[PDB]
Write a protein that binds this ligand. Structure first.
Ligand SMILES: CCCCCCCCCCCCCCCCCC(=O)OC[C@H](COP(=O)([O-])OCC(O)COP(=O)([O-])OC[C@@H](COC(=O)CCCCCCCCCCCCCCCCC)OC(=O)CCCCCCCCCCCCCCCCC)OC(=O)CCCCCCCCCCCCCCCCC
Ligand SMILES: CCCCCCCCCCCCCCCCCC(=O)OC[C@H](COP(=O)(O)OCCN)OC(=O)CCCCCCCCCCCCCCCCC
Ligand SMILES: CCCCCCCCCCCCCCCCCC(=O)OC[C@H](COP(=O)(O)OCCN)OC(=O)CCCCCCCCCCCCCCCCC
Ligand SMILES: NC(=O)C1=CN([C@@H]2O[C@H](COP(=O)(O)OP(=O)(O)OC[C@H]3O[C@@H](n4cnc5c(N)ncnc54)[C@H](OP(=O)(O)O)[C@@H]3O)[C@@H](O)[C@H]2O)C=CC1
Ligand SMILES: *P(=O)(O)OCC(C)(C)[C@H](O)C(=O)NCCC(=O)NCCSC(=O)CCCCCCCCCCCCC
Ligand code: SF4
Ligand code: SF4
Ligand SMILES: [Zn+2]
Lengths: 242, 154, 185, 122, 427, 118, 353, 133
């Protein structure tokens, strides 16, 4: 083996000993207080400009969320697409979350990106098993397949959509798997039938039944209530005594 | 006809030899309730089986009560199809597609609303609560004028 | 599409150059077309590879490199005494990402806490190694053995008699890999 | 039908006159298509059995008196029509809609109490 | 009063076609007879797929053709939809992490990076500096690994077959480093909430430096074959051209976004890990075509190598794992010696750690574009909802808008310039 | 089945089961799947229970003794065993025997003992 | 149909009636499972949760049978009709044993005597050696101990030896079977040069292999079928020429019929069978089979006794012959004037591509 | 290989051994004997070859198989250790339960492993005893 002859063994070099390592303790939420006031300000401006649809807004750390009426979908996303201070020209993601304890089961979550302002915004609305939501493929061509997924996986129906068909599931599939009443292994299974010369569909049997270890969740709450971190600019002034 | 099992319900693809015979299948006409079980794509068997809505009791084994705070909706076990022994490995096989599925609800009426929306049969179990009684460390050392009838040992 | 604030210094492209503004001599430009010089260079790079040593390994006589942390087929180990290390805590059963482990335990004749069943579905397992990170007694490991294709998948339902037989077989190599990686675990 | 051959933009029924018009047009297309479904999917049934079985699937929802429920039931039909008329569904999905090609057959619930008792709930 | 007011249809939902507005008439930019102009032309459909390369394993795209050109392209996906997002609801957070290795299966440690960063944000924890550098080094080793698959499989489809084999030895060498830190050549499971599973072995940073000294020569010879080659140039110029405005409107990220002249990288715009500590450049194209996206990807080879060398020189000492046993597993030696450590060991492997309630959308600059996850937490030990945003899912959705009017031999080039692994697209 | 000794004897070292819910190999390896089969090729590990009781006692002068399994960090979690009963005390994790030197007279007088005791 | 089965020996079975992962609790041994009938009996037991022991001669052939069952259900045993140990150990655990083994021709290793007698002997002696509960012998239609046909003779003699040593034998005498992968419809479908000596004038009652496969399941499930003989056949009388025209009416195939007299055909038939190593479809004994007509035993039970309806072959020809239907754009009918007009609204050439 | 390398190794191993290797490994290769497996396999090392080719095996059987390598040598051939089992103390542990011979992968043969249930049936049924009449 012909060694490079001016490339020495990097392992043969001795390293300077590291003694006592010290790291400060940081609270990562603390880095987000400097932008907490404007994120609240922007959400406050948004719901004054569209009082007809924006029910509330929340702020967690760097995330501002806007809560809207389902019928306000087209106006709100138009304002967030074509406003000069709201130049949010990407849909990053549209998905649903299921809350069977609500009268409107489905929360529709939109995540939007503004390359102009290096900013993100989340828009939430609600839907039901029968209550449809406006499609926004009139504003974002990229939102088309996302709504097919929400429909395919949840059953939510998007008025105005061209070609709202299943995107993920099999062709004659019945059910919406991301619903919380839908079982994990489904209701049907497939196999090849020698006597019928095709693949047939059967009721589900499992050689091993799925073992659900949810019951081992701590009898004690482990996170607690948290900490309130609202700007003083969005708290009500307190009445001074006397 | 008054809880009579409709033996002539039209089965579907997922109906099996373990599916019970339903009494009522959501026609889509009942007042004030969405017929969600009619448009859900779920099998008919969901409309035959009963679910239990209850608040889980605190374990006897420990004093945390986090799991008693929310209502759980679960499916009742059937007489056949819940578990059998696998002939090969001895594993436990099942035909119950609902065996590992449970739902959580904040109030009892939220669970009832969901059950009726999906056409489930439901039995609600009312929580068992404690009876408050003031407890005092000082009683451990109360004075007995007469016979002791108890030797407290800390 | 660009960030807010002043546009980047010279973000806008220069105006396009006309064909006769380009800096490339006709001789150089026409020669590169007809002689196909850039394609000639690439063919020459393949001649350079031709006369370089190949990368190939003759398997099964020469094997590729595997680290002490390699994740192969499972094994149940013993102590130096000969007792099984496994005490049936079931931690490896709880953490299994794919529910591949089924354990049934009871009190042994001598009163010791030991498993009666220990099955691993080798066709459910994802070879994550989680089962062996969670062990408090180093009882379950993954040997460096990757060569065990079988004929039937019934052969891939490892029961406790096979997993102990594997540990007896592979113990020197299991003890060696543990000895290397224990400081990092 | 801009993106696909049988695509229909998702529409919300304006009233019951409109909603019944759409149902009848949905049923008409399906029973029209039954000869075309029986050759492509090589269904070993008469076109009459296919048409009478298509009728059953509309006969299930004849008593729906909610307009929001009809539109989801119409969208489900239109999507099923699109994936059947384009050869997207496999013969296995299509002839699995007929609930007699189970090796247990159409008779899969017990007939009455006693026959399901002697067979252990079927 | 939905759904009650919807029973009789007293309200209609305002569709986007209601809010359509006529274009301004003034500044607006651009029949039946005996002639053959009125005559119609029939089209025929074609079933494309599966191609030989591994990445496009489950693609059944149905094209409508007018002669040779593509009229409309309809991809049918779902052939590798395995229900990951549902199975993640029945697992603890640590148990759900291996699901992310199997999303984009050529870029494993960056899939598990976005899941760790999302969970760590809800945990409200700061991970130690050493794991920050370990993660940014192995995130760029991952980026090189993916680009070796993506660029060389793209050219193998286009018909150049030799660069593929050369760079898969480079791939074969860079998977030895995966198997040394973990024990897997493909699915490491190495990056975890709170840092990394185990410290790197004691001679690895020397072995990566030895690989580093020669990797540029591998890019240069791969570049010898494709960059100036006229056949390569004439098969990617003008192919799959997307405007900057449309790439944004189509949900394009990454080089699909960057090849049309938009300067934008998640690493520069929302820095994560040790990316704010490293100097690197961002290749941005001009003409929005496949040739630009090939040239942008080759430049990232050289930029990822430039980051890996910087990470080697700034590798600090200290824990590679968040120093808190209520979140990360204690050392084996502690668990076998200290009471508190065995308790924390036991509960982490059975119940798991609780994540505080809330939701977060977290994105990273994945090698195939922007990869993000939406995690709803219920304050418990299992995720209430995990949603994966896959860059290729949005890219394949814009395949019809981009391949329209192109030839089928052009469309195979468009499939490879979009970094497409179908386990990513179907989750 | 039946004819080979390996199909009949529960382990090479031991002939009988060592727990109440253990299946005998005679009944586990009956049936059709074990026809046309080599039973000497079948996995048959040595029984741990027989090996642990061949272990000599650690005599100790202390009331509490510490067992970590004998391999440092390669053993089990370190625990403490009390040897104050006139019996042999055994580690719960590994089974090794411990006995106080005060009970040597009594232990040496027993007819049958659960560990070799020497 | 019941959940409890007390076997003829007396042990009880507690079955759970479902599909693949279920518990049928019947253990079966099917001899002759790699042919065309055996795949229907095997699949029917296996897909309902029963162990099926499948003795096989060739490894490759048996492979399609394992798909029908879950792990531990289809067990394969290497066996030879002249190795008794292989037969013995195949039936020691079985509740029911089937025997479907049978050729139509002599080989260089088996005369119709060796197969149907020396194998049934060797096999039923094992059934009697282990007190197996049900033993079902599939014989042939027209089986008769004194017949000019060695197939009807040697298969008729097996029926004798079956009950001489096992009196509780079900006999099953099926008509020529038809369907997927048969030698009846597929013969008329596939061959081109066809040799006969009785003008294709055989008359019989063709039966679908699928009801035969389903019927053999029900003889296991009814204890009353034990010890009697069945005659499975279809609903309508048919002649081979009438059967062929159905094949003809579906597929539109032209075949050569040679129909050489019996004296010049049979001596020649032996030769071709003695030198060609594949089943050539004509042999000495097979030609003699052409002259007989099926005669239905009036003392034997039928489909109806098993609650079953046979189907005729006319309702099935389109199904099992559709794969053999060469239909391109060429063979289409001449076009009508209405559709000729429709073509004038299209351009049939792309002049810019 | 290349002529300079293959020529030198002929000058070492001889023409009868040169043909042995062409039949099995397919390379002309020379190195020092490092040790023998219990299964009879022989191990060679040469620091002067291409990387990952410094260690190889000459199998004892004609129908060789990668499962014929004894476990501690398996770690050596895979570059997982540098000390061969000939100087590794971990192989000098006495373990009477340890296998006496090397058993290879035993699938595709009548000795293939067959799983079974290890536990007893869950529910015991009544053994009927009819009282006398
Ligand atoms: C422009 C053309 C070359 C472009 C490619 C780059 C060439 C290169 O880098 O060469 C340096 C390169 C240095 O490589 P190395 O790793 O230092 O080789 C040292 C070994 O000792 C070398 O071991 P060796 O045994 O290979 O060398 C001795 C001898 C052994 O070969 C022979 O004596 C005869 C072989 C051929 C006949 C039998 C078949 O080989 C030669 O001298 C060359 C003979 C073959 C030349 C023609 C080959 C086909 C074209 O030299 C070669 O390998 C070949 C030289 C160039 C040949 C061009 C023709
Ligand atoms: C050993 C070396 C040869 C090995 C085989 C090499 C095969 C080369 C085949 C190349 C074909 C390239 C092609 O399709 O055309 C490229 C081009 C002609 O097409 P054009 O539209 O003018 O493109 C201009 C920019 N290339 O440009 C050309 O290819 C034209 C070059 C002239 C060809 C040779 C004529 C004699 C000099
Ligand atoms: C090389 C092959 C050597 C074969 C030697 C002769 C073997 C022999 O006698 O085979 C008899 C065989 C007739 O076929 P057989 O196997 O008896 O029955 C199947 C259906 N005819 O007939 C043959 O196969 C013999 C002729 C072989 C070449 C045709
Ligand atoms: N199908 C029909 O038209 C009719 C058939 N029958 C009888 O029904 C039974 C089953 O019918 P079918 O499925 O068509 O038969 P096939 O000829 O298709 O299959 C017969 C089976 O017997 C086995 N076999 C044949 N000869 C021997 C031998 N010497 N030793 C061991 N095994 C042997 C074959 O195994 P291998 O493939 O290895 O040879 C095969 O599994 C046969 O007895 C047949 O004669 C009765 C009346 C009509
Ligand atoms: P007449 O006035 O008596 O009845 C007319 C209707 C039915 C409209 C009633 O007046 C009515 O108002 N009924 C309630 C409205 C209603 O029917 N809602 C549902 C309509 S959509 C629907 O029923 C869809 C059924 C399934 C569609 C697919 C059927 C075929 C699928 C399988 C085909 C075979 C395999 C490929
Ligand atoms: S192998 Fe380890 S983790 Fe698994 S049950 Fe045994 S002791 Fe517990
Ligand atoms: S490596 Fe396999 S057996 Fe172990 S925990 Fe992971 S999936 Fe389960
Ligand atoms: Zn111990």
């Amino acid at each position: 083996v012909a060694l490079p002859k001016d490339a020495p063994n990097p392992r043969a070099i001795p390293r300077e000993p590291v003694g006592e390592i010290k790291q400060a303790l940081v609270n990562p939420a603390d880095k987000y207080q400097s932008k907490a006031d404007n994120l609240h300000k922007y959400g406050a401006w948004l719901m004054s400009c569209l009082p007809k649809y924006i029910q509330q807004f929340s702020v967690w750390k760097d995330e501002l969320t806007i809560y809207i009426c389902p019928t306000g979908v087209i106006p709100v996303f138009s304002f967030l697409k074509y406003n000069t201070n709201a130049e949010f020209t990407q849909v990053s993601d549209i998905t649903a979350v299921d809350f069977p304890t609500r009268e409107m089961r489905f929360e529709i979550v939109y995540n939007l990106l503004s390359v102009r302002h290096n900013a993100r915004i989340r828009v939430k609305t609600y839907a039901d098993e029968v209550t449809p939501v406006p499609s926004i493929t009139s504003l974002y061509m990229g939102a088309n397949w996302y709504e097919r997924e929400v429909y395919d996986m949840f059953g939510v129906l998007f008025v105005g959509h061209p070609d709202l068909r299943r995107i993920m599931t099999d062709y004659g599939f019945e059910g919406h798997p991301l619903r919380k009443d839908f079982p994990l292994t489904g209701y049907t299974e497939i196999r090849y039938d020698e006597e019928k010369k095709r693949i047939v569909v059967e009721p589900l049997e499992l050689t091993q039944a799925f073992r659900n270890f949810e019951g081992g969740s701590s009898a004690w709450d482990q996170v607690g209530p948290g900490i309130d971190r609202t700007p003083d600019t969005f708290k009500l002034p307190t009445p001074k005594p006397e | 006809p008054r809880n009579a099992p409709d033996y002539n319900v039209p089965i579907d693809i997922a109906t099996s030899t373990f599916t019970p015979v339903p009494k009522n299948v959501q026609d889509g006409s009942e007042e004030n309730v969405v017929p969600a079980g009619l448009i859900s794509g779920a099998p008919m068997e969901l409309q035959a089986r009963t679910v239990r809505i209850y608040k889980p009791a605190k374990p006897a084994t420990q004093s945390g009560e986090k799991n008693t705070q929310l209502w759980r909706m679960d499916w009742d076990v059937l007489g056949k199809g819940h578990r059998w022994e696998n002939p090969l490995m001895g594993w436990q096989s099942s035909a119950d597609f609902m065996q590992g599925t449970h739902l959580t609800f904040k109030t009892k009426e939220d669970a009832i609303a969901f059950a009726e929306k999906q056409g489930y049969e439901y039995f609600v179990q009312e929580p068992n609560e404690r009876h408050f009684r003031p407890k005092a460390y000082a009683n451990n050392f109360l004075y007995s004028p007469g016979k002791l009838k108890h030797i407290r040992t800390k | 599409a660009t960030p807010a604030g002043p546009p980047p210094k010279n973000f806008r492209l220069p105006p396009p150059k006309n064909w006769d503004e380009e800096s490339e001599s006709t001789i150089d430009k026409v020669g590169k077309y007809f002689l196909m010089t850039e394609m000639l260079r690439g063919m020459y790079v393949l001649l350079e590879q031709f006369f370089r040593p190949p990368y190939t390994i003759y398997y099964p006589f020469e094997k590729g490199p595997i680290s002490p942390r390699f994740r192969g087929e499972h094994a149940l180990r013993r102590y130096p005494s000969g007792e099984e290390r496994c005490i049936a805590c079931k931690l490896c059963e709880a953490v299994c990402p794919a529910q591949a482990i089924t354990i049934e335990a009871e009190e042994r004749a001598d009163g010791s806490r030991r498993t009666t069943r220990y099955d691993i579905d080798m066709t459910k397992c994802i070879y994550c190694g989680f089962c062996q990170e969670s062990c408090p007694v180093d009882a379950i490991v993954e040997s460096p053995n990757a060569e065990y294709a079988t004929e039937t998948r019934e052969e891939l339902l490892y029961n406790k008699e096979k997993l102990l037989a594997n540990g007896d077989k592979w113990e020197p190599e299991l003890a060696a890999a543990i000895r290397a990686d224990a400081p990092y675990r | 039908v801009q993106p696909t051959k049988f695509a229909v933009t998702v529409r919300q029924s304006r009233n019951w006159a409109d909603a019944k018009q759409r149902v009848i047009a949905a049923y008409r297309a399906w029973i029209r298509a039954a000869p075309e479904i029986q050759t492509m999917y090589s269904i070993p049934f008469p076109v009459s059995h296919i048409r009478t079985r298509i009728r059953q699937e509309f006969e299930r929802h004849r008593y729906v008196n909610k307009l929001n429920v009809v539109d989801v039931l119409l969208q489900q039909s239109n999507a099923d029509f699109q994936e059947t008329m384009n050869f997207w569904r496999q013969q296995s999905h299509v002839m699995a809609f007929f609930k007699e090609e189970h090796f247990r057959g159409e008779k899969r619930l017990p007939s009455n109490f006693i026959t399901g008792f002697l067979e252990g709930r079927n | 009063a939905e759904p009650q007011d919807g029973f009789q249809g007293t309200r209609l939902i305002p569709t986007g076609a209601d809010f359509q507005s006529p274009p301004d008439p003034f500044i607006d930019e651009g029949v039946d007879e005996d002639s053959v102009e009125g005559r119609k032309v029939r089209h025929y459909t074609v079933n494309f797929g599966p191609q030989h390369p591994a990445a496009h394993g489950v693609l059944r795209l149905i094209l409508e053709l007018n002669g040779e050109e593509i009229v409309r392209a309809d991809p049918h996906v779902g052939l590798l939809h395995r229900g990951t997002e549902k199975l993640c609801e029945y697992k603890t957070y640590m148990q759900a992490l291996p699901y992310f290795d199997r999303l984009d299966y050529v870029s494993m440690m960056t899939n598990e990076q976005v899941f760790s960063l999302a969970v760590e944000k809800l945990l409200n924890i700061e991970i130690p500096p050493r794991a920050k550098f370990i993660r940014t080094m192995f995130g760029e080793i991952t980026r090189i690994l993916n680009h070796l698959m993506s660029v060389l499989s793209h050219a193998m489809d286009v018909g150049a077959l030799t660069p593929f084999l050369w760079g898969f030895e480079e791939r074969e060498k860079l998977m030895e480093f995966y198997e040394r830190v973990s024990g897997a050549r493909l699915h490491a499971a190495y990056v975890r909430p709170g840092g990394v599973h185990q410290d790197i072995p004691v001679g690895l940073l020397d072995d990566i430096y030895q690989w580093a000294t020669q990797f540029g020569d591998r890019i240069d010879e791969t570049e010898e074959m494709l960059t100036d080659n006229r056949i390569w140039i004439n098969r990617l110029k003008g192919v799959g051209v997307v405007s900057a405005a449309d790439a944004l409107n189509l949900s394009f990220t990454g080089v699909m976004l960057r090849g049309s002249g938009v300067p934008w990288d998640v690493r520069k715009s929302s820095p994560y890990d040790a990316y704010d500590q490293v100097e690197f450049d961002v290749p941005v194209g001009i003409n929005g075509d496949c040739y630009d996206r090939y040239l942008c990807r080759m430049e990232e080879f050289r930029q990822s190598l430039r980051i890996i060398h910087q990470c080697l020189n700034k590798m600090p000492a200290g824990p590679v794992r968040y120093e808190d046993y209520k979140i990360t597993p204690p050392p084996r030696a502690a668990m076998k010696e200290n009471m508190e450590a065995l308790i924390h060991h036991f509960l982490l492997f059975t119940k798991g750690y609780a994540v505080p309630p809330g939701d977060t959308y977290t994105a990273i600059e994945a090698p195939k574009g922007e990869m993000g996850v939406y995690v709803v937490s219920d304050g418990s030990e299992r995720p209430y909802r995990v949603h994966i945003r896959a860059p290729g899912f949005a890219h394949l959705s814009g395949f019809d808008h981009i391949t329209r009017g192109h030839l089928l031999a052009d469309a195979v080039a468009v499939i490879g310039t979009m970094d497409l692994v179908f386990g990513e697209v179907d989750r | 089945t039946g004819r080979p000794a390996s199909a009949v004897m529960q382990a090479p070292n031991r002939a009988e089961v060592w727990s109440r819910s253990q299946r005998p190999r005679s009944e586990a390896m009956a049936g059709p799947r074990f026809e046309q089969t080599d039973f000497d090729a079948q996995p048959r590990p040595w029984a741990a229970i027989e090996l642990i009781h061949k272990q000599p006692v650690r005599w100790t002068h202390d009331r509490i003794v510490a067992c970590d399994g004998g391999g440092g960090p390669h053993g089990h979690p370190k625990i403490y065993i009390n040897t104050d009963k006139p019996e042999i005390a055994t580690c719960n994790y590994c089974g090794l025997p411990f006995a106080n030197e005060h009970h040597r007279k009594y232990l040496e007088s027993l007819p049958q003992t659960s560990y070799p005791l020497n | 149909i019941s959940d409890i089965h007390i076997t003829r020996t007396g042990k009880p079975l507690i079955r759970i009636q479902g599909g693949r992962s279920s518990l049928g609790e019947h253990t079966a041994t099917v001899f002759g499972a790699t042919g065309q009938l055996g795949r229907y009996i095997v699949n029917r037991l296996a897909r309902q949760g029963c162990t099926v022991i499948v003795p096989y001669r060739e490894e490759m052939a048996k492979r399609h049978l394992k798909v029908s069952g879950d792990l531990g259900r289809v067990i394969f045993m290497e066996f030879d009709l002249r190795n008794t140990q292989s037969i013995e150990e195949s039936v020691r655990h079985s509740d029911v044993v089937y025997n479907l083994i049978g050729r139509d021709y002599p080989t260089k290793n088996f005369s119709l005597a060796d197969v149907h007698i020396e194998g049934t002997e060797r096999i039923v002696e094992a059934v009697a050696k282990y007190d197996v509960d049900r033993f079902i012998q599939v014989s042939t239609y027209n089986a008769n101990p004194d017949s000019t046909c060695e197939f009807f003779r040697t298969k008729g003699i097996a029926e004798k030896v079956a009950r001489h040593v096992f009196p509780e034998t079900t006999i099953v005498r099926p008509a020529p079977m038809f369907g997927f992968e048969d030698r009846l419809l597929l013969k008329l479908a596939s061959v081109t040069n066809l040799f006969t000596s009785n003008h294709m004038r055989e008359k019989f009652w063709p039966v679908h292999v699928n009801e035969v496969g389903e019927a053999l399941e029900r003889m296991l499930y009814d204890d009353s079928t034990a010890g009697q003989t069945f005659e499975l056949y279809g609903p309508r009388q048919y002649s081979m020429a009438q059967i062929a025209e159905l094949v003809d009416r579906e597929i539109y195939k032209k075949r050569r019929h040679i129909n050489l007299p019996k004296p010049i055909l049979q001596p020649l038939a032996e030769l071709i069978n003695r030198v060609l190593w594949w089943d050539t479809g004509l042999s000495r004994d097979q030609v003699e089979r052409e002259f007989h007509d099926q005669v239905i035993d009036p003392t034997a039970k039928t489909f109806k006794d098993l609650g079953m309806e046979p189907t005729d072959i006319s309702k099935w020809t389109y199904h099992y012959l559709l794969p053999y239907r060469p239909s391109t754009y060429y063979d289409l009918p001449p076009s009508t004037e209405k559709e000729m007009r429709e073509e004038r609204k299209y351009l049939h050439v792309l002049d810019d591509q | 290989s290349y002529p300079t390398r293959t020529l030198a190794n002929l000058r070492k191993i001889g023409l009868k051994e040169y043909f042995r290797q062409l039949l099995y490994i397919g390379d002309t290769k020379y190195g020092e004997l490092v040790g023998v497996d219990k299964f009879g396999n022989k191990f060679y090392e040469n620091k002067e070859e291409l990387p990952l080719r410094t260690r190889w095996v000459d199998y004892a059987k004609h129908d060789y198989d990668a499962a014929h390598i004894e476990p501690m040598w398996h770690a050596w051939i895979s570059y997982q250790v540098d000390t061969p089992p000939t100087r590794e103390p971990l192989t000098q542990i006495e373990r009477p339960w340890a296998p006496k011979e090397h058993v290879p992968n035993r699938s595709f043969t009548r000795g293939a492993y067959k799983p079974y249930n290890t536990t007893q049936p869950k529910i015991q049924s009544w053994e009927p005893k009819a009282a006398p009449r």
